[model samples]
Target: DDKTITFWHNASAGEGRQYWENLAKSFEEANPGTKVEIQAIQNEDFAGKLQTAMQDPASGPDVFMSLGGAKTKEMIDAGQVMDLTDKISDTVKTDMKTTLSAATFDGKVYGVPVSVEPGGMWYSKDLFKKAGVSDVPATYEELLADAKKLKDSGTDAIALGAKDAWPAAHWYYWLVLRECSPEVYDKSVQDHDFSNACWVNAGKKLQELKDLKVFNDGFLTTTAQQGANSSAGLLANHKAAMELMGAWEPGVLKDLTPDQKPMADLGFFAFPEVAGGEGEPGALMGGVTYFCVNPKASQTSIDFVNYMGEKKNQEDYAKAFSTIPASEPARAVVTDESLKQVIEYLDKAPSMQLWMDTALGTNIGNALNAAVVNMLSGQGSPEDIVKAMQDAAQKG
Candidate 1:
């Protein structure tokens, strides 16, 4: 009898798409009598599609990408996700120890972490030099000052893709990480409570940036990473100075560049410090992208996900995607300078929070994301953001 595993992922274009295709073929070759059916979906459309598919076991993917936070918790609670604590390979349990926590809940692992994506600023060194900026900003005020210089030099100081909502909300998320103490931050997320003053302060900080008009022209319409015209593409093509994105920026930029290679001038720096905040100085915000198996998936699906955990396969994944692999031993293969910087910061971060939307789960997360975007677009206020979160949580 032949066994098949249906796999879905959000690497719909360029080298990322090819990498998944190649990996599937290789897996099939290694396991004769087994087949891996691959589906590559666009990132923006993946969540809704996955939600619809998962409603029926026969139609759902056997393996699929999961953000591994509140979203994973929902799946686990609904019995849609498999608990991999005992089924996953020893290599995954041992080599991916640090990152596995993202996919673990109540002491059981539910997904295989593929990449550790710590968020930060990805900028063009050449653009900074051209703008006469001498160094990366260390404080929030300095970041504003540098944005002025970059704008005066006749370039957009920042690239924002508010059209996607979440990318725009990232500015607010990082500010929350800077303004709120870790204790309050974790408690607020856990309890779905936004009563902390820091939450409003974070929105105010983002409002400060919006008031300066530092973002690219027509930013409200810009997409995140779809093509040459997206926010990542603007930075890739040198039309914008910087973008705050995950460790995956280098890989996305590589695909968007004219030559389809890593951008030579790409550089990374942690988000700037905020004065008079209770948050830890070096706190980071990010999430691990992982693959979770359906509760009813075939054993072949389990074996295949375990195979992907091997150090060699992880190394190849890191090289192909220009990212930080979850496997510690596979990190030596990381060559992107910007990604290396991200890894360094990840190592020293006093605390690392999952992306705000991922931590808040879908409904409230969507409300928060939209509220931030509305604030940036001049349709809402800082208080409105807090109100939105409170309202969403109340509804739940």
Candidate 2:
């Protein structure tokens, strides 16, 4: 146990866990005399274990993982991570400029970014054809209009899961952030500014969606576990035409509907962009996952981490998730043709709107889920959401 690196990851027996475990194997092969003491815990335990593990040297891991799009800066500020500025190679660092910045605090590199996840629209080509939608919407107005058409055509436009609060709020958050500038987004988050225009506008849009009755019946009553099934059933049985999800879902659906002839009919597109949003109209919410080291790491642990940051390992990790690694070299290894379009679109995009985890700071960031829950229940007024932020800023 002592000779091992004692890796503590949030993955377990699933595909996500397999991704890191494969990296661990590669790291061991590349650098002998070090094995990873891997521990796969439940998702609920990830944050708590990570925080406590970083609190002290003995119980903590030598090389631990953190979220680039999460409160990584907070971890770095607390001295819970190693400054990889000197550890990560030049080529790796330069190729990862897009998302690596999220893991960087001040001037030091706190971790190695492994992957960037993009949330977008997932639809069925068959359903779209049936609904007479010639193409996916390119703007917010078009999206609403298209959704209404589908509604009139007796096709569900959105596959929303009210039980899974986060998934459902993707709509509200994307609208709020998209309508506002990134700088304004940051200011509101950091200062808790409630008077921001976009905030209320976002709320109005949400209320509009509610009025449309876009969500399935008893949506407000669904819990996370129940919601996932409901959402899946909607698309599986042809009740809904599309859902807002990350790339990981394709594989999940593939697994679920293996025998269905038209299983491969799944298609995707970006969320319709607003006309005058800050950065770009079509910019999507992007996230990154990083590997941070415990400053108290032994020489062997540090060396092992360095071994895992090369182009090959990054490529392997990203491929495991069917995602594009932020690194250019890793990007080159992504041969999956379905993902190419997304990469190409994002490349020309005016801005890649950062995820709330990194773009929004701690206090309000922590309250995000709760605030969203209120909004979904029709209790958290858009104005109130804005006011809460403003109040948070004044007090902060």
Candidate 3:
């Protein structure tokens, strides 16, 4: 018999919740007399509360969802997170090599991603038909043209939920991804050098797009997802032509639809290329939601995360979340065409950039998101965005 292990996640109530609970129960059944205390927090509140718990180990859960980045890196550096290097199997380490980079620091892996979410443009095909746009845009200019066409046709061209600032922040990050080469980006992060003109130019790009008047009305106040009125909902309801979002959009769209039915005409495409950008067209900016064990956790806790990565559980995980599984074996079970394509894109990507706000840690990330939000709201300038990020970098 093992001691009860506390597990925490941000899967709100429903299938996600049910899957975890059932898995925990199954785990308990497999290992007699063991119990997993489940704690499912709201997504937006995960980071703040998780950090609070990390500051006091005794109060923290034994296993919790982790997004690998500056915050998790800090935890690893502070010995708050566990070292799963030896605990996790070689097979897993090899199978999940692509996703392990973000969770690895100083040449050691600390966690394993449960699901990988890649950012892209998800659009409504029916909306495109209504707008008389026959093909999805493959370049930035074309995308803008399509947006204009959609706007002229009386559809909200692009649905953005800037009320959840991160949604707006994602646009700026994708711009930077298109403009800056991987070398420039890595150097900026590792060297904390935000002085490059590309940073400012990325802001200019966002400003230019803002000038196009493509976003939906009151976009600044629009929430990303809530009931049938979110940005995803707008797209689901055909109120908007498109949304720039992660692979998780489909599930959110399904949940927000009036009948909770999947959108039949929904489709996805990679972010269109910037005309003269230096970055690789195949490079992607996305994230993986992983889990790390607590340094104070028992052997059972480590086993739990590894168990969650097992093929059977990973397959079930994908069904519940409708996301790309980081586990190779489980990925084979995924039949969602759009998600499968996203997985292929992620796999074939020349370089993958994790969310800048996340990769930069909380303070810098928050400042960066705020800067983007301000720019989107027309309250800030391109220079202001760059200046704010530079200031945050200097302080961090």
Candidate 4:
């Protein structure tokens, strides 16, 4: 028998842990004679453990996590992950072309994306009907208009998790991409030239959203995961209309309406077009979270890698995590109406940008998180955020 394939994850408790286990059990059942060993690690410093483990075969997992972009090059350079070019089968390749591309580095594919993730406006139908909102907003102005209606109905129109700096920072990247192009965003940060008119426009939009007073009253000070967290108790509890969130938002089984909430129930659309702009109306921003493998591993390890990629296996695994399928098209597997909204948007997206953090190396990406926290709290300026990002880019 082959050595077990050890899979490492950040999910610890609640439905998060269950999601991975469910997939493991199903994968085991189908593979027969193969074992999928899962290690539930705390996310707080899992990266440190991953880096340390990669140094010692005994400590490292057979499979680990990575984001989109070229950062995997560093992993490959350090001998941290493997190159799967000649390892994967044809059927797996045909089904996961997009995901493979996101995980490829230096002409060789390494990691396998388990899902397709892109962010959008997730609306609450119950809140919409309560606010007398007959339809969802399409343009920026209409969004403000409908948000006002929700506010008037005593629902927090928008719920943002201020404590999670990256969540706050995402608004900046997507807003910029929504107005200009990814090319412009790249130049502003990559080349240290923020004078790009779109950069100012991106900042102005942030201020505008703030001026509208639609966000929760104490948004600046609240930790998203803490008591009555803006997103959990408020939006998830039906106290608000919408929340800008990631693919994993729905995985929390405790927050959903058991009877009617389908993965596609909440409607999703590309962040409504920014009035008139050079940006495409269907431009999307997000990427697959790859499960990278250690190339130094044996043939047994390689088989474990490919086996974990089976569409059916990944689909069942995503059931608990609510992640889009990286290996197979999630549209076919997702039954929840609430989550399908995101799938629908991804299918329509003509262009997609990886989340800024997902696209960058660790150090700079972490700095980007801190800067956005400053910007949202009114303690940091767009200029400061830009400066911090530039510094990170220079070092990155």
- Could you say which candidate leads in TM-score? 1
lDDT of 3 by residue, 1-396 (tens): 246999999887557788899999999999887899999897778888898888988778899998568878878877788888888867668667778777888888888778889999999998898889898898888998999999999999999998888899898989888888778988987777888888888899888889999998888888887657779889989899999998878878876777877788888999988987887778888888889988889999988888888878988988887778888888988777788889888878887778888888777888888889898888999889878877888767
**lDDT value for model 3:** 0.85
- Backbone-clash count (model 3): 0
What digit string (tens of lDDT, one per residue) describes model 4 on residues 1-396?
355778887776556677778767766776677687898886545666777788876567887877456455556777778788888867568778876777777678887666677777676787888889887777778888888899899889987777666667777777777777667767654554555677567767776787788988877765444344645446666666787766666664243443414333364545777875567667878867767777656665666557657766677756656657776554477766656777777766677777866566666677777887776767777677667766877766
Name the best candidate (by lDDT): 1
Worst 10 residues of 4 by lDDT: 256-265
Each prediction's TM-score versus the true structure = 0.98, 0.85, 0.96, 0.86
lDDT value, candidate 1, whole model: 0.90
lDDT of 1 by residue, 109-134 (tens): 99888889999999999999998988
Q: Which 10 consecutive positions of candidate 1 have the poorest summed lDDT?
A: 67-76
Query: In candidate 2, where is summed lDDT lowest over 10 consecutive residues?
Result: 254-263
Instruction: In model 2, state the lDDT of residue 320.
Output: 61
